[PDB]
Structures are given as structure tokens and as C-alpha cells.
Design a protein around this ligand. Structure first.
Ligand SMILES: [Zn+2]
Ligand SMILES: [Zn+2]
Lengths: 160, 162
RNA sequence: GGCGCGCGCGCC
RNA sequence: GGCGCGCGCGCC
């Protein structure tokens, strides 16, 4: 099986391996709890127009090193998960000298690696990943605050 | 200012170098007369809804090797030219060992290489690019038949626009 | 925010 | 058919 590293397209720092990308209703999310070490998390100070219980778009995520925006964090199935934008990535096959960028995830699926559907075990691995250390807790506070704001609008819409 | 190879995303066969792509009113056409060796030209049997004298979308073009559809040929200012679709292409930078796919010809300009607007000089090398071998003549015949059908529809549109 | 898809207008 | 705008739909 060919494993790829997923790198920032701008500064070439590594975010995670391809084996951690899994789909939830066509949202391509990262299920390596280590990936948060390589992301700044910042509030948009604007709740999503998409309001649902099971799939909540929350804080933006930036490359830890070059600070470009690289996607968005979500709460999906009650779990915090990053979604890296395919346009922010460069793919390198382990032990090869080539690099590839793709316009669409479907090109990644056809040309690089199969992406499977996430299962409940994958969500459980990511739960509470942002715990215990100063660096993690800062990020958790930002997600938690954005989630509270999201839920406030959600409940408000559903009031009537 | 890197040069890129434009390849079939399906089978990796090379069609041409990036320096041969030039725009005509945001149509990104190939002006390498050699490119036709790498394309099959297949009639569509259905005239475009866009009818004009100077920019006629005509026969489909397919990868010579794998026969995937890769775009469409046009007659532009009286000259036949291939339009490769960005969706069927992988761009490769040989020296960097890098390859890229792009959603729009517009992202190719932004991210990969400058594309100039075509001038009259560019058309001259393409003028008789299909007139020199048995195989190229057979492509020209397909294009001319599709052009004749296009013109015939155009006549009618011009006519009862009145 | 992701993924897929319609329709209309403009230039060619 | 290309490119640029608009408006909208489905699933999450
Ligand atoms: Zn970076
Ligand atoms: Zn091919």
C-alpha cells in the first residue's frame, strides 16, 4: 500500500499521513490526533450559515509554521476534527522524490490513495484530543467558544 | 518561468509543452503544429449551440493512446486548433519532479505559468498543420465536414435573425 | 465550511 | 465548447 505525506503547499511542513484521512458524507477529515500540533486554531467570529447538530463548521485552521489558512475545524458527530482543504496540500509518496498537487479530492482518490468512510472507532480516537497541555487547552477554548456560539444560533433557529 | 509538460491525466501520454498554449478571448488553444499526432479527431454529429463564423466549436479530440476525451477542436479565424480541457490534463514540471491538476485554465495562469494572448504570428505555424500526411488529412476531413455543418446552421441563424 | 448538481446573463 | 459573473437545489 502506498502511503503519502500531506504537506503545506506553501512551506512544505508535514501535517499527517494519508492513512488518517477519512470521509464523513463527503467531508474529508483528519483522524490523527497528532495533527493538531501543526495547526493554529482561530475563531471566525461569525457562525456558519449551515446549522445542524451532527456537522458544525467552527474555527478556521492555519498552518502552524507559515500561518496560511489550510481549512476549517468542525464538530462532526460530537467530535472536534480538522478538515484540510485539498488546495492547501502537497502530497509526497513515502520514499519517492515526486510531489503532487490536486485540484479535487476525487483526483486524490483516483490517482494517489483510496479514502475510506470514517467509522465510529475513528471518531472515538479523536475525542478529547485537545487536553492536558497548555498548547492543547488554548485551542480547545477557541473551539469550545465557537461551538457554544453555533449551538446558540442552532437553538434559536429551532425555537420556531 | 518554468516549462511544463501537458499530459493525459488518464494514461500520462504527453501532448505538448506549456509554451504552446495561447488564449483567444479566454479559449486556451494549442499552437504546436505537432500536437495533432497525439490526438484522434472524432465528429460530434451535433452542431454547437454557439454559432459564429470566427470561433466554431467543432469535432471532439481524444487522447491518441487511451482515447479518453480530452477537449474539442475549434476553427478560430479560419484555422483549426485543439482546445485541451484542464480537466483531462496533468501538468508536469520535469526538473522539480512535480505534477499538478487544476480546476480551471485560470488557476494554471495563476499558479503555474504565464499564458499569452494569441497574435497573428501564432496562427501562421498552425495554418497547414493538417495538410501534410495521410493521417493528418483524415483529421482535416472530419473537421471540414463538421465546419460545413456548422456553417450551414449559422446561415439559418443569420438569416432569420434577419 | 465540504461534496455534488441546475438555471440565467456577458464576451469568444 | 471556453472563460467570467449571478441566482438557486440536494446530502452532510
Ligand atoms: Zn505552511
Ligand atoms: Zn491518454
Amino acid at each position: 500500500n502506498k502511503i503519502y505525506k500531506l504537506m503545506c503547499s506553501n512551506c512544505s511542513k508535514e501535517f499527517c499521513k494519508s492513512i488518517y484521512i477519512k470521509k464523513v458524507f463527503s467531508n474529508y477529515m483528519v483522524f490523527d490526533p497528532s495533527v493538531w500540533r501543526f495547526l493554529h486554531v482561530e475563531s471566525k467570529r461569525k457562525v456558519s450559515k449551515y446549522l445542524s447538530e451532527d456537522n458544525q463548521p467552527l474555527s478556521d485552521i492555519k498552518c502552524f509554521h507559515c500561518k496560511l489558512d489550510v481549512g476549517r475545524a468542525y464538530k462532526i458527530r460530537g467530535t472536534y476534527l480538522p478538515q484540510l482543504s485539498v488546495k492547501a496540500l502537497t502530497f509526497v509518496q513515502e520514499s519517492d522524490y515526486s510531489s503532487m498537487t490536486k485540484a479535487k479530492w476525487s483526483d486524490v482518490e483516483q490517482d494517489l490513495f483510496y479514502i475510506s468512510e470514517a467509522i465510529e472507532d475513528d471518531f472515538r480516537i479523536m475525542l478529547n484530543a485537545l487536553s492536558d497541555t497548555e498548547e492543547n487547552i488554548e485551542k480547545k477554548i477557541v473551539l469550545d467558544l465557537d461551538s457554544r456560539q453555533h449551538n446558540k444560533q442552532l437553538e434559536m433557529k429551532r425555537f420556531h
